[PDB]
Design a protein around this ligand. Structure first.
Ligand SMILES: *Cc1c(COP(=O)(O)O)cnc(C)c1O
Ligand SMILES: *Cc1c(COP(=O)(O)O)cnc(C)c1O
Ligand SMILES: *Cc1c(COP(=O)(O)O)cnc(C)c1O
Ligand SMILES: *Cc1c(COP(=O)(O)O)cnc(C)c1O
Ligand SMILES: [Mg+2]
Ligand SMILES: [Mg+2]
Ligand SMILES: [Mg+2]
Ligand SMILES: [Mg+2]
Ligand SMILES: [Mg+2]
Ligand SMILES: [Mg+2]
Ligand SMILES: [Mg+2]
Ligand SMILES: [Mg+2]
Lengths: 385, 385, 385, 385
């Protein structure tokens, strides 16, 4: 398969597997085997030996996501968090420093601030939407600039190409967590990022039924260290999960186009309502970084955050008033979800500059019919009065 | 379910799940969901929120293995290696020291020696079968004594109770990797170990189809830190894998009794043959530590290692001559396997005191009929001449 | 959930399952259990006893497809064929008669003609696109008129409402095999059909990884007999397959809209090429029954058949020349497929009026990028010269 | 693999699959694909085309069970009932007759008596333990003698060889439903049966998590008709279920030996108690047909039925008093179950000669520790007083 000559929807179905030369099954077989027979000691039959070191069903997934990012290399992990931990352990050692943003998944922040600081790593938080702030925070020991764009949950936007330029003449690498945009909307390697991280739990799987992570790169050395760590630390996905993830990925383009259609309409409806003080959606002209988003994103995504004029009580009542959109953690599935980040996904950021306003609700707009989602949002807003 | 009043086979089926109060399915449902609806923000319906932080199908497995070890607490991970890495990160920090044995899974050693030494951890290798050697190696900064018994691949034996006594008056914890014995043959917590590790990839799953790890303890603080890390680093098992693992575990006693029946007979047959210089099997009277094994193990296991009088060429030819026993990595499945550790599972120990003799073959004796396994071993031995 | 007030995409995600009142998982749990504990003899805990008689994971699927058809009742089976066999056995007995069309899945025809005629059932084949031909073939013993529209493989069109009117004053029931249109494009119960059949193997699952069938109706007596036969003959789906099918169904609308976008463009391109004698696609103005299709179908589907001016040799060479579209049986998956019906899916119709022209290729247009599918078709057409 | 030279436990692991010549996975891959690429129209790559007509994962299972029965041929189905229905449809036509026993699975009886009699088939019920009664019931139109031994639920015993001799000079075939004995305890083809049926739902799977059926034979014509019907009627198993079934089958010998150990001890304990009027267990010297069972069965099985001196009230109270043995339908899993057949599995036999005494409880003795099962039975018996 050649990624450079085929479209995204084509690649999402065909980049990882073609019907094999044995039976020719249309889909990758599920190789639920921990081991593989060898033809003689350490002479492998067809490249595989032990599933923690490699399995074809997992490699199919890896190759697919790599192709969708414009990447030669990809490696999969048991979760987005485990992928982040492995990338941290490759890039950093005691005495090194990270530049991190001021709006970010609470789990990323918790890992740095609770775990990696106990192992000798330093960090600085900055507003990554201000290129000069990032530039000022880079020290001689900075090995990593960690960017999420759009950020979770406020949907803040960073200019990837501009921040990548800052790493020239330095030993810093730029890693973009591309979970919210997905590879369908944004390809950070093409703008100068060194590596890209995904939680495949979210949009790539798309069906809220498999936890997973994945790292992609064009750096063969980085691919070798990801493989070394995949096998040597062992946070590897199940073959069943890697099959389910890849299955979901086959509909990413059609899903995301509907998520973005729906979110544009719900954001416009929220922006007309006096219960709402602020709609956070990258496609709105006044959203901070809108012009950066429109240059680097194909569309503006399925996520919306909303700040309520009636404060935390209104935010929480909105959370318990919806009847189609479900109150739950996570995002990026076909079903619509909502949550209150200050008490739920980002309770771990309390006390830090990443702490989220208590009047804020984060909504993952699914692929249900827009008329039904508009009706549910409207009735929930009317339940506040 | 009460573990203290029921037998091992009973617990292996019933300690993790009883038919629920909703539908009453005989087996734990497979909760292939990343998230769970809440009744209000951060008010959970029945204890679950997000699968990386907890899922009922995974907790069923955890509770089952905990009960089989005489443990109050258990936590599952994506692999034996990932479980080891998490336990290392809980117990150690920069500046701390580990005492490790001289025969051990090459992956354990690689993790310490390549990764943890780069993060400021020190270690010392000793022969853990010599209690005085362990005692001498404990320093004021020793936080961990890591014991495997029987060891992989030489089946060396450590006196768990004796080594546990060494940790009194110290800040060292004893962790036993109980993979080879399984909880059916040996219960290190009852002899004073602080925690127990398993690769469930091996005997606990038993069917060579799921990679997994698990840690058990009676220390509630340790359970809290395992949970924190499970969720915060995220090397969590798939729900499908945790179901398959627990499914396999339901036959552990009946499997292991057949593995041990078969291995006793194959070890006796090997001990009569002049092609063999040494049979390594804990149940043989001259195996080093046999008397220690007979005190702390119910039976002597399914693993045998063999050293060939004709050296490496004979070891490798034996590997390619068997027709029922398969040449492959791994162990503890219903099918019989064999491998050459110096070139395969322990190639990573080359150069170290853990390096394995090149004349050594490690055999995982399965549950096939003994007459057929004896016939296969006999014909393979006759192929050397 | 109320189907009558929510949209198709909403229903496809939410009509079968809402997060339960036990744990609240976002998705239906996989109840991989053959049996369920009872509270006393034949006093069920929550409606379930034995999976062949009923399982919640299967009922979730059933309820979802029923809602998408405007049906109160649905029952699932191991395959489209097994669903057809069960419906035949309910509606017919020895001495009864069926009216069948002249273009139909070869397996339907084989079942009638090889099996049911040996059990005393009679049939007549007619062109169901000619309402008067159907009317003339109805006898006093006719219990079933079996309609496929569009037909497999020629995409012939039947006026469902008109044929349903013919059953007034008779003991005949109209059953529509709605596999090719799916419930997203066509709802035969709303036009007077008595029951609707699907092979969920095709579009409803959508991922070419699960074989299944399903029958929907508004007749409660028919639902009772489908249940009786589901449990009493036992062609029941696996719980894993019913979960996978329902998972796929969550993207039916977004998939089908892309399949129809793509097929409209490929049909137009084929209609411009002199290698092609006839393009069979319901959306073309000259396709027989186009006006009937436009009244009863929302869009015209993802399937195209093509007859080649160079006869069978050209049809077969086209089959082996495509490099993205794969030569294989089946249809309705995200990947594009093609086949030669005379030698493959319809070889069983040889000798009958259903026999398919040897110059005919049937194409299942997937959801790949149109530019890549156009390029593949164009290069394959150029390989004929 | 050669079945004739290897033992049962060997075959149960190795008769269906050997590590392939492509990747060499230790276990059969799960081919979750409905279709397979062809090299040209109707030129298959490696024997497979469409999963309803054949799939390698299903064929692995089929070949395994065939080998365990001493059979050249095997074909799998979605349930035991669907397998029975297919075998009925092959062997019988309108006007033919069946000889059936007087104690039999209620579902078998329901299928004959409700469905097949409506299609022109006749039957006669006899006591199949009386060879002369079977002989007398054979007519010129008899095509099938259907034997279960031991019977469900009374554990009645039929002399297979003797009944097979009755079919000489006739057009009758003997089919044995070998579900309760399993192939580990009894091999009816070796005693003259024409075909053997299993519900793999029970012992062969062994884990109460997969519904399935299977038919084995040495008649190649019968294998061709089973294949024809498998594909043409389509009651085919899921690939996931066929993998799970075969996984379970790998421990059949070790499971069954423990089930039989346990059942012998529970039957002896029940036979000492005055609450019990009759213990039905084939290994008891006074059980009718004990001497026949000891000739044709390796051991006497895991099932026990019990008739209570205090009648139906005592039978039902025993059912609700056990705390380890669970009240549920089904049998042959690792967990112990019990049920009241008159109200549960055999309510469908009410009114017929197959109707089961209301004082009768059927117990599926699992593989839990005997001390715990004895304790549970003893306490439940003491709850009657
Ligand atoms: C959810 C999420 C993660 C963590 O991924 P998991 O798969 O839940 O471990 C990381 N980054 C972002 C932006 C996320 O939303
Ligand atoms: C295999 C093994 C491990 C590693 O477990 P994985 O599940 O392969 O990561 C650890 N300890 C021992 C003794 C082992 O044999
Ligand atoms: C494929 C198909 C069937 C048969 O369904 P299976 O799931 O393959 O048994 C029936 N009807 C039509 C129109 C089909 O294309
Ligand atoms: C359970 C059983 C059957 C029916 O099998 P299913 O898999 O439940 O359809 C047939 N025969 C006997 C003896 C059984 O116990
Ligand atoms: Mg990129
Ligand atoms: Mg939640
Ligand atoms: Mg212990
Ligand atoms: Mg190997
Ligand atoms: Mg309809
Ligand atoms: Mg094919
Ligand atoms: Mg037999
Ligand atoms: Mg029940």
């Amino acid at each position: 398969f050649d990624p450079n000559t085929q479209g995204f929807s084509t690649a999402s179905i065909h980049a990882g597997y073609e019907p094999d030369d044995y039976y020719g099954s249309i889909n990758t077989p599920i190789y639920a085997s921990t081991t593989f027979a060898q033809n003689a000691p350490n002479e492998l039959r067809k490249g595989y030996e032990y599933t923690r070191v490699g399995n074809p069903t997992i490699v199919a997934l890896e190759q697919t996501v790599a192709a969708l990012e414009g990447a030669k290399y990809g490696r999969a992990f048991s979760s987005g968090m485990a992928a982040t931990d492995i990338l941290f352990r490759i890039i950093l050692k005691p005495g090194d420093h990270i530049v991190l943003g001021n709006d970010a998944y609470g789990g990323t922040y918790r890992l740095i601030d609770t775990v990696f600081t106990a192992w000798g790593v330093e960090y600085t938080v900055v507003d990554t939407s201000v290129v000069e702030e990032v530039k000022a925070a880079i020290k001689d020991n900075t090995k990593l600039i960690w960017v999420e764009t759009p950020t979770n949950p406020a949907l803040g936007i960073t200019d990837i190409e501009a921040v990548a330029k800052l790493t020239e003449g330095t030993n810093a690498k730029l890693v973009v967590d591309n979970t919210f945009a997905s590879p369908y909307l944004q390809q950070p390697l093409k703008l100068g990022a060194h590596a890209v991280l995904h939680s495949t739990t979210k949009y790539i799987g798309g069906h809220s039924d498999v936890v997973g992570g994945l790292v992609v790169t064009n750096d063969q050395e980085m691919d070798e260290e990801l493989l070394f760590m995949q096998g040597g630390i062992g946070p590897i996905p199940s073959v069943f999960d890697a099959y389910l993830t890849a299955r979901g990925l086959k509909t990413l383009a059609v899903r995301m186009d509907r998520h973005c259609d729906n979110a544009e309409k719900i954001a416009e409806f929220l922006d007309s309502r006096p219960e709402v003080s602020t709609v956070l959606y990258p496609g709105l002209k006044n959203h901070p970084g809108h012009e950066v988003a429109a240059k680097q994103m194909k569309r503006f995504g399925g996520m919306i955050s909303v700040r309520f004029a009636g404060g935390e009580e209104a935010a929480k009542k909105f959370c318990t008033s919806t009847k189609l959109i479900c109150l739950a953690e996570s995002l990026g599935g076909v079903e619509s979800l909502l949550e209150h980040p200050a008490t739920m996904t980002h309770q771990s950021a309390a006390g830090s500059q990443l702490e989220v306003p208590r009047d804020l609700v984060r909504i993952s707009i699914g692929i249900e019919d827009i008329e039904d989602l508009l009706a549910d949002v409207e009735q929930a807003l009317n339940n506040l009065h």
